[PDB]
């Protein structure tokens, strides 16, 4: 190939069964509340740092504003 494989994120990794839990809430409320971040952290098993960040890294993206051509 060219390099081999992209490796930035830590060993940990979120699954479709866990992400879905973070996505579903996305609709209801952009970002989870100190209360939701906890209730979820247990529902899925992810920490409060992973969930919070995810919402950001993801949300921030949606906030992006690109021009239209075509």
In whole angstroms, what is the distance from residue 22 CA to residue 5 CA?
27
The most distant pair of C-alpha atoms in the chain lies apart, rounded to whole Å, by 46
Instruction: Give the rounded distance of the alpha carbon of 50 from its chain centre.
Output: 8
Token digits for 44? 């899925």
Q: Are 48 and 41 in contact (CB under 8 A)?
A: yes
57: helix, strand or coil? helix
| Token code pair at residue 63 | 């906030």
Tell me which CATH code domain 14-68 carries: 1.10.10.60
Domain boundaries, the chain: 14-68
């Amino acid at each position: 190939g060219s390099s081999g494989s992209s490796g930035k994120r830590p060993r940990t990794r979120i699954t479709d069964d866990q992400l879905r839990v973070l996505r579903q809430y996305f609709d209801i409320n952009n970002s989870p509340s100190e209360e939701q971040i906890k209730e979820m952290a247990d529902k899925s098993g992810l920490p409060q740092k992973v969930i919070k960040h995810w919402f950001r890294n993801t949300l921030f993206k949606e906030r992006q504003s690109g021009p239209s051509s075509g």
